[PDB]
Structures are given as structure tokens and as C-alpha cells.
């Protein structure tokens, strides 16, 4: 009961602006489908498979050899994002490092870091973004210094006041990963208490604001011209696989510890329920501040703010400055942002860890010196995201590291088990390990509804793509071309493996096609001609 109701990064920073950028109301219908039709099905499915084989996300695949390149290409993934999962958590901590004061930043504008078009509604062009507010100009000039670069082509040296916050984020993260695989008995209670009681005091107050009507009613109007198009869904679906966890490797890698008694159905179900429940009122608690800012800078609501990654950088600090006492509110939200982006930066790291070792068992041996080249790596890799125009390279891995890339591993994956393995097998395994069988409804989820929605995505999501912007800037073409082959570097490794598999075993095409299907603990049926693959009643199994 310590691990449904902990709350993910994901809820409280990148669904905020994803349902702001795609309206109110009509991003929650294909979230909530997407959530129950894919997520649910999926996140059991990964549940039970590591529970079971007691193996990593690349070693699981000891039932068919065939797709270790999934779980390769799962554990790049990972590595990719957890590349700019740190700026933000160093973000927090500048933001942190600043609350410290009865004036708080954000409030005048009248620092060395604002520009001389800077109004005060206090102290008082149409389809434009309005950023000459305080806290605007504060985190675009105070944090990232953005006012030095002009474009990608341009993104100067790294700024040190933020290198200094990202060494610190990099040696609390080594020292929480080199004695074990577990290192999390302390920080369990903070990341399922603090942030309930964070949005349930903002929303009282967010809803006690003047304004914030007409950010509700927006929130609770569903746009149905809106819909019937592919970027409401694309983002939902990936939302979900953010939200969820499910195509990274983090499941299967910490369910492996398990003990063999485990009901994941009533944690699946369980987390499925307060993901849900934590997004609507995430939302909910946006909207009203929005609509409130709208109200104070006298312009419409799709103009108020911006619609990047920065967006509760810039709403959660005007919100707090309406509270009584500031400065404690501050402290504790941002407390709770660093709480939240340590645990998940640590769950990606084990994630990776575990898959990686499993493989080669001479790294068991040495958890020093890889977990250290892990952190260093990811440390010399983030380096890139915190310089003078760092936001446009964030920006571009934000859209390309996990994209249709993690959508492809996500078929691969259900794809494999459920018509290579046997969803039958996969069913009397759960019969073994937890005594009763899963049912229709997960069997026809696991093997044909989901596949056909995650391929309908997979394939509109090439159809319908859309060139990169951030805000009024426009990326030029060779910067989409870079984003391309970062996606497809993980999409390449899965026909790598399935080629090279191929050659390296001997023997006719019917055994090196026979040797690449069967579990590798029933090889010796391959001499004897009984492999189950080679007939029909094998795949018409429902
Ligand atoms: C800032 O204000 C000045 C005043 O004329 C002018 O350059 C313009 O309105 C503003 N600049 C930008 C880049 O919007």
C-alpha cells in the first residue's frame, strides 16, 4: 500500500501543459480511453512477466530469443530521458536556493534581469504569447538566460549557476545507488504525503480565486472540432505511457524483486485509479489558476501563458504569491518537486542498472565503477541542456526520445508475449503463481485490442508529423532530421538482433527458425520435432 498511492513527476509537471496545449476537456476523453484500453491491460501484463521469470528487462526474453532488441531498445530509452529528467530537477533546486527571502523574485520587476518592456500589473499582437510578466521574465532571464541565444544554431557555453545544482543533483543520485539495489527506506513518505496535501490546499485556494470561473467553465467545455485530429491523440497515448511507467523497464525491473505470492491485478487496478484521479485534479487546479491570470493581465486565456515545458515554473509561483506566508508554501512545494524528481531519476537509474547487469554478470561484481559511469555519462550528456539555449535541445529530446519510439516498443512487447509465447501459457502462469486464471477481458485486451489501437498510433503518428516549434520560434529542417534518427536509433535495434540471432545459429532454416521461438530451457525439443509454434491450434489460441 506504499506503492499505488506514490505519486510520478509525470502528473505533477508534463500533463499540466499537454491538456493546456490541447484545451481543456477534450484532452481527457482520449486520455481516459487510452488509459483504461491500452495502459491497464499493459501495466498487469508487466507486472506479472518480471514477477514471474525473476529477470531484467533484457533477460526476460529468455522465452523468445528473438526480441531482446525490445528490451535493449526499452533500456535506451531510458537513458535517453533520464538525460533531461535532471535539468528539471535542477531547476527545483535554483528555484529552492531562491525561496529563501521575504521577497520572493517573481514578484517585482524591478531586478537586473528584466527588460525595460516589463509592465507590473500591481503597480499598473493578438495571437502572441504574453511574457513581459515578473515571473516570465524571471524564468526566462534569471534561470535559463535564454535573451543570449537566438536559435539551436546558437546555444553559447553552459551557464555555472545551474552546473552547480546538476553536480549536486548527480552526486546525491550516485550516492543513493552504489551499496544496493534498493537504497529507499527513507524517502517512501514524503512522495505519497506531501504532494496530496500540496494540491489539496491549491485547489481550495485556486478555486477561491477571482476569475478562475472562467478557466473552469473552459476546463468543463469539451471541443469537438478539436478531436478528429491526430495530436490529441498522439499525445495522450504517450501521456499514458509516461504517466504509467509501462516501456521504460522500470516494472519489469523492480517487479523481479517480488515475492512469489504477489497480487499485481490489485495494484494495477489500484494505480490505474489514482493516476486517474491525480490528473483530473491537477488539471482542475491549473485551469483555475489560469483562468485567474487571465483575469489580472487582462488578455484571454490562450495567451496568458506559454505551452513548453516551464509552464508550472511560471503558474505555481504566481499562485503561491497569493497564499499568506509565501515564503514556508514556496519552500514546501519546491521540497516536494525535488522529493519527486529524486525518486523518479532514482527509479530510472535502477531501472537501467538492473537490465544492464543481468546480461553480463561480470558487472555484478563492480557496481561501483558502473554505477559511476552511468552517473558520469548522464552528467556529460546533460551538460548540453543546461547552456544559454538550452531549452530549444530540452525541448527536441522531450519530443523525440520517447515518441513513436516507445509506442513501437510497447507493440513489440505485447506483440511477442502475446502470439510468440502463448497468451494460454501466460495465463497458466498467473494460475500457478497467483491461483486463479486472469479472465476474457484481459485475454482479448492482451492479444487484439490493444495492438491494433498502439499500430493505428504508430502508423498515424508518421502520417500526420508535424514540424518542431517552441512558442514563436520555428526549428529549421536539419534539426528535425537530428530528432528522426534519435528516434529511430532505438527503433533500428529490434530487426538488428532478430538478423543476428539468425546467422550466428546453425543448422537448415526450419531449426535456426525453430531455435529462435522456443524458450530456452525446452531447446531439447527442437531434436525431437515439437515445437507448438509450427501449428494452427497454437495460433488461433484466444
Ligand atoms: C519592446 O518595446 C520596444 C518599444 O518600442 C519595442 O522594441 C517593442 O515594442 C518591444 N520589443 C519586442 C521584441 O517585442
Not at 546538476?166 to 527513507?186: A, D, E, H, R
Amino acid at each position: 500500500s506504499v506503492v499505488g498511492f506514490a505519486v510520478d513527476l509525470a502528473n505533477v509537471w508534463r500533463f499540466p501543459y499537454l491538456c493546456y496545449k490541447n484545451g481543456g476537456g477534450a484532452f481527457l476523453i482520449p486520455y481516459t480511453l487510452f488509459l483504461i484500453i491500452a495502459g491497464m491491460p499493459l501495466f498487469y501484463m508487466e507486472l506479472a512477466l518480471g514477477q514471474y521469470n525473476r529477470e531484467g528487462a533484457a533477460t526476460v526474453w529468455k522465452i523468445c530469443p528473438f526480441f531482446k532488441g525490445v528490451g535493449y531498445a526499452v533500456i535506451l530509452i531510458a537513458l535517453y530521458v533520464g538525460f533531461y529528467y535532471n535539468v528539471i530537477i535542477a531547476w527545483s533546486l535554483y528555484y529552492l536556493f531562491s525561496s529563501f527571502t521575504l521577497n520572493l523574485p517573481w514578484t517585482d520587476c524591478g531586478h537586473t534581469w528584466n527588460s525595460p518592456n516589463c509592465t507590473d500589473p500591481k503597480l499598473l499582437t493578438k495571437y502572441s504569447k504574453y511574457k513581459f510578466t515578473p515571473a516570465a521574465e524571471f524564468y526566462e532571464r534569471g534561470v535559463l538566460h535564454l535573451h543570449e541565444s537566438s536559435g539551436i544554431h546558437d546555444i553559447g557555453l553552459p551557464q555555472w549557476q545551474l552546473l552547480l545544482c546538476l553536480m549536486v543533483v548527480v552526486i546525491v543520485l550516485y550516492f543513493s545507488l552504489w551499496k544496493g539495489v534498493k537504497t529507499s527506506g527513507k524517502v517512501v513518505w514524503i512522495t505519497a504525503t506531501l504532494p496530496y496535501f500540496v494540491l489539496f490546499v491549491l485547489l481550495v485556494h485556486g478555486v477561491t480565486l477571482p476569475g478562475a470561473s472562467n478557466g473552469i467553465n473552459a476546463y468543463l467545455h469539451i471541443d469537438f472540432y478539436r478531436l478528429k485530429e491526430a495530436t490529441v491523440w498522439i499525445d495522450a497515448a504517450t501521456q499514458i505511457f509516461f504517466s504509467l511507467g509501462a516501456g521504460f523497464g522500470v516494472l519489469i525491473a523492480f517487479a523481479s524483486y517480488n515475492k512469489f505470492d504477489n497480487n499485481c491485478y490489485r495494484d494495477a487496478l489500484l494505480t490505474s485509479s489514482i493516476n486517474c484521479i491525480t490528473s483530473f485534479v491537477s488539471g482542475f487546479a491549473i485551469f483555475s489558476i489560469l483562468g485567474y491570470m487571465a483575469h489580472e493581465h487582462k488578455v484571454n486565456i490562450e495567451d496568458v501563458a506559454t505551452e513548453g515545458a516551464g509552464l508550472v515554473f511560471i503558474l505555481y509561483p504566481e499562485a503561491i504569491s497569493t497564499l499568506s506566508g509565501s515564503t514556508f508554501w514556496a519552500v514546501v512545494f519546491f521540497v516536494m518537486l525535488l522529493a519527486l524528481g529524486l525518486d523518479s531519476s532514482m527509479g530510472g537509474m535502477e531501472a537501467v542498472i538492473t537490465g544492464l547487469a543481468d546480461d553480463f554478470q561480470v558487472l555484478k561484481r563492480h557496481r561501483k565503477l558502473f554505477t559511476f559511469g552511468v552517473t558520469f555519462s548522464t552528467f556529460l550528456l546533460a551538460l548540453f541542456c543546461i547552456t544559454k539555449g538550452g531549452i530549444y535541445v530540452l525541448t527536441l529530446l522531450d519530443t523525440f526520445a520517447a515518441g513513436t519510439s516507445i509506442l513501437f516498443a510497447v507493440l513489440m512487447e505485447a506483440i511477442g508475449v502475446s502470439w510468440f509465447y502463448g497468451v494460454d501459457r501466460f495465463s497458466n502462469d498467473i494460475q500457478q503463481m497467483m491461483g486463479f486464471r486472469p479472465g476474457l477481458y484481459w485475454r482479448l485486451c492482451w492479444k487484439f485490442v490493444s495492438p491494433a489501437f498502439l499500430l493505428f498510433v504508430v502508423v498515424v503518428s508518421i502520417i500526420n508529423f508535424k514540424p518542431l516549434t517552441y512558442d514563436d520560434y520555428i526549428f529549421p529542417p536539419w534539426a528535425n532530421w537530428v530528432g528522426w534518427g534519435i528516434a529511430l536509433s532505438s527503433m533500428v535495434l529490434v530487426p538488428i538482433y532478430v538478423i543476428y540471432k539468425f546467422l550466428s545459429t546453425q543448422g537448415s532454416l526450419w531449426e535456426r527458425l525453430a531455435y529462435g521461438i522456443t524458450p530456452e530451457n525446452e531447446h531439447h525439443l527442437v531434436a525431437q520435432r515439437d515445437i507448438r509454434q509450427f501449428q494452427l491450434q497454437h495460433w488461433l489460441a484466444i
